[PDB]
Ligand binder design. Structure first.
Ligand SMILES: N[C@@H](CC(=O)O)C(=O)O
Ligand SMILES: [Mg+2]
Ligand SMILES: [Mg+2]
Ligand SMILES: [Mg+2]
Ligand SMILES: [Mg+2]
Ligand SMILES: [Mg+2]
Ligand SMILES: [Mg+2]
Ligand SMILES: [Mg+2]
Ligand SMILES: [Mg+2]
Ligand SMILES: [Mg+2]
Ligand SMILES: [Mg+2]
Ligand SMILES: [Mg+2]
Ligand SMILES: [Mg+2]
Ligand SMILES: [Mg+2]
Ligand SMILES: [Mg+2]
Ligand SMILES: [Mg+2]
Ligand SMILES: [Mg+2]
Ligand SMILES: [Mg+2]
Ligand SMILES: [Mg+2]
Ligand SMILES: [Mg+2]
Lengths: 70, 116, 153, 66
RNA sequence: CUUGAGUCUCGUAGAGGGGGGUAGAAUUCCAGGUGUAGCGGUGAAAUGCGUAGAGAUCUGGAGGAAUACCGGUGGCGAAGGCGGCCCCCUGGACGAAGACUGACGCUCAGGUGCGAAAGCGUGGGGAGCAAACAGGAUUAGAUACCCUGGUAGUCCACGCCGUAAACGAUGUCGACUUGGAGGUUGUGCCGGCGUGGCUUCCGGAGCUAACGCGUUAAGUCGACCGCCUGGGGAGUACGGCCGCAAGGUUAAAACUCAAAUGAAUUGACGGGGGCCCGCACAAGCGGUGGAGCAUGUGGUUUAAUUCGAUGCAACGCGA
């Protein structure tokens, strides 16, 4: 995430461009994910739980479109 | 006593503390300041405000070298990442570029999860 | 409360000067619903104060407050079992109320003989940054400054 | 979406083809997911092999902080 | 005889396996430079490291272990499991057009092999992590959780162990029985229409105690095997076999109980979640708790100190 400040560029927006580049690279999450050891059993329990919950919200959204609240 | 006008700031932002080291382009340190040594202990030490004070003291520590432009190399996940870069600009340096140099293994086993 | 159905209460101005800020000071100083006793204390204190500084009745009382009004204060918040004092800005109405309350409580804990003189002496030092009313403002500002790192929730 | 390797009928993604490979890595040098670029699963694997194979020959970088 | 089973031909995908080599990032250590007072850690601290110059930053080197992104209810494998890249050796699966053999099948007690991790043996290696251990805290205590260190071990070679919630808690093979939405990998024809393999989710009949399963069945059937017979005692004892040991395996009874249990229901509760409320906090003011007295209660005393109320919701209460 290398941001080179451009000419006639106000500082803050370059600081905004930097915050964007680090989040798109996901480096902060990558550091937080690597600070404690994650067992292979648990990484898989999470991955699965992520997928089944990502799946459930889609069908819940498809279904809620065929509904009225009032 | 030497005049450089072109230095590099190394923000070391951990979850517990922030260290600011201003080096020349060759990597030789000119001065440094930390959030812990800026009058902040414990809960205060790991705040964005404690890092801002740490940045200002490091800018006040290298004032005799007359640095004019300053590269900023940010490392770590700490709360003192963003607020330390602002304080370097507030002092009166010119931020030429900002980079994240946080080391990522592509490595060793990390310590075990804390059961708090 | 939880509903926020609190509207502001009406308050009649002071008789001698028609100052709304002065009427609230009498109420703060009043004890047991004896407002007439509190007005006579406040008036004779102001006559001593105005004569002692030569400025005037009202705006010489305003100079006492301007050196006692706090501008930042800490509210408790417990996060990890340990309680953080979080400094928060004081809105203008509470700044006036705190300053008047701090003056009255500092005056009461004074060794003068009569309260009217006791109040005037406290206000006189407060005008010149010497009283125990301004010292409590001193304390609040440094308790808020020791916690500037916590200006967040 | 619109996988550009079925569209161009590629038979192998050819790590020597640095012109193509640079379109499928980020600014910091990481392979972009097939979810973002809409590459087919079959070609995304060959793309990752070619990128790792070019990284070894220093035709491509591993990271941006070399 | 050719439809089950198999062989040949062309290709496809794959972390299938075994052996060798190598790359980049990072950690740690070593040596040096700049520099100076903290670093580290936590809920907060302390232990610990640091003026003998740490931490930070740069330069060079050593070493081991794991391969970010790609990466996906994606793939491969009988299962256990398998993830950088390259080569060598090797297994299986699938698909298309035929040819060939001629049911040559399925299942399988005993037997044989493979079989996570921990562990064991011998010889290496040892960065990071980390049982044991040591210290610092926390605590009433804290043989813990947290912190700082740290040895076996984790890694390699060969040998042993032979067990796991080794799970889909679902044996293997075959046939049959409405659908929808995907993923993945072939293939034929003209993005469109077919046809195969594997796989994920929903659901119909049916089935089920229910939950649920539902063409990958827990539906309808056939073939063969394994296993069960109330809970505890007990997967324990004794014996045999196996093992270097740790132990594994096979596997009781006396005794005792009248239940133990599965699924779902209604509550209640949670140091679960969400949304609300109340002098519930907060923001304020005045009190009580200290003093004297009044009054009630307890206790004690008395011949009697009449009886009752006695968490909130008894105690200036019946009175
Ligand atoms: N970081 C890589 C290996 C190193 O570290 C991984 O997580 O697999
Ligand atoms: Mg730690
Ligand atoms: Mg064959
Ligand atoms: Mg057998
Ligand atoms: Mg092992
Ligand atoms: Mg060993
Ligand atoms: Mg050994
Ligand atoms: Mg430990
Ligand atoms: Mg398993
Ligand atoms: Mg499983
Ligand atoms: Mg079983
Ligand atoms: Mg179903
Ligand atoms: Mg036994
Ligand atoms: Mg035995
Ligand atoms: Mg309150
Ligand atoms: Mg009393
Ligand atoms: Mg009674
Ligand atoms: Mg009684
Ligand atoms: Mg009641
Ligand atoms: Mg009453």
């Amino acid at each position: 995430p290398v941001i080179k400040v451009r000419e006639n560029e106000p500082f803050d927006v370059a600081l905004r461009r930097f915050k964007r580049s680090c989040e798109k690279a996901g480096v902060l999450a990558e550091v937080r994910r690597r600070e404690f050891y994650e067992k292979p059993t648990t990484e898989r329990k999470r991955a699965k739980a992520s997928a089944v919950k990502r799946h459930a919200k889609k069908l819940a959204r498809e279904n809620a479109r065929r509904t009225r609240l009032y | 006593r030497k005049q450089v006008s072109d230095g590099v700031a190394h923000i070391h932002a951990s979850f517990n503390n922030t260290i600011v080291t201003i080096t020349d382009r060759q990597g030789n340190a000119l001065g440094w300041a930390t959030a812990g040594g800026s009058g902040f202990r414990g809960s205060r030490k790991s705040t964005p405000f404690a890092a801002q004070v740490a940045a200002e003291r490091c800018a006040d520590a290298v004032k005799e070298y007359g640095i004019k432009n300053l590269e900023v190399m940010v490392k770590g996940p700490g709360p003192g990442r963003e607020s330390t870069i602002r304080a370097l600009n507030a002092a009166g340096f010119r931020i030429t570029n900002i980079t994240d140099v946080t080391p990522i293994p592509h490595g060793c086993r990390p310590p075990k999860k804390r059961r708090v | 409360p939880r509903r926020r159905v609190i509207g502001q209460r009406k308050i009649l101005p002071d008789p001698k000067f028609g100052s709304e800020l002065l009427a609230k000071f009498v109420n703060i100083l009043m004890v047991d619903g004896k407002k007439s006793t509190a007005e006579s204390i406040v008036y004779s204190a102001l006559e001593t104060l105005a004569q002692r500084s030569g400025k005037s009745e009202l705006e010489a009382f305003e100079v006492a407050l301007e050196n006692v009004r706090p501008t930042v204060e800490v509210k408790s918040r417990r996060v990890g079992g340990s309680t953080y004092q979080v400094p928060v800005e004081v809105r203008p109405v509470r700044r006036n109320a705190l300053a008047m309350r701090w003056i009255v409580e500092a005056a009461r804990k004074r060794g003068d003989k009569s309260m009217a003189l006791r109040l005037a002496n406290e206000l006189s030092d407060a005008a010149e940054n010497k009283g125990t009313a301004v010292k409590k403002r001193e304390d609040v500002h440094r308790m808020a400054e020791a916690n500037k790192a916590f200006a967040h929730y | 979406k619109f996988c550009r390797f079925t569209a161009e009928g590629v038979q192998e993604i050819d790590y020597k083809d640095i012109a193509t490979l640079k379109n499928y890595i980020t600014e910091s040098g990481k392979i972009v997911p097939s979810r973002i670029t809409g590459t087919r699963a079959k070609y995304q694997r060959q793309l990752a092999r070619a990128i790792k194979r070019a990284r070894y020959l220093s035709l491509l970088p591993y990271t941006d902080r070399h």
